[PDB]
Amino acid sequence: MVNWAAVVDDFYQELFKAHPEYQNKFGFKGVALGSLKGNAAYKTQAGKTVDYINAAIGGSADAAGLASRHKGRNVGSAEFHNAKACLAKACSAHGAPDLGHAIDDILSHL
Numbered sequence: 001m002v003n004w005a006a007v008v009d010d011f012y013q014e015l016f017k018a019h020p021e022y023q024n025k026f027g028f029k030g031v032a033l034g035s036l037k038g039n040a041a042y043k044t045q046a047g048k049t050v051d052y053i054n055a056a057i058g059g060s061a062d063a064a065g066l067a068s069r070h071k072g073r074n075v076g077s078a079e080f081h082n083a084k085a086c087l088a089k090a091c092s093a094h095g096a097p098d099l100g101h102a103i104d105d106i107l108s109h110l
């Protein structure tokens, strides 16, 4: 099976390296990037992200619900376009299928 946990770890590395201020919205605010794997708040967030990816692939993802929750954190379309680029880089680095179509589903509600 595709190692989505490894893809997601690479995704967060890319995302927070390009946009370090995004990290301030999370329970692992301030934690060095090379330390995220040892952080409990990060472990939970990464696990939910992997779960979302598996739900999107499996056909049960609630993209409108995820979009609404991100609006609830003042996260919008621009941030998601940035995330889409970071996730594409992560997928490619692992020889994983691109998830652009899934992210476009969320973007359609942003």
Ligand code: HEM
Binding pocket: 022, 023, 025, 026, 027, 045, 048, 049, 052, 069, 070, 073, 075, 079, 080, 082, 083, 084, 087, 103
């Ligand atoms: C590839 C695009 C993204 C995916 C798949 C994704 C996925 C998720 C998931 C699955 C959750 C948990 C939702 C829940 O518990 O109901 C979440 C929460 C969150 N996301 Fe994202 N996200 C994306 C992009 C972003 C971006 C660009 C930001 C910018 C800061 C962001 C900020 C947040 C925040 C602040 C939370 C709440 C974390 C908490 O409860 O402490 N997300 N995201």
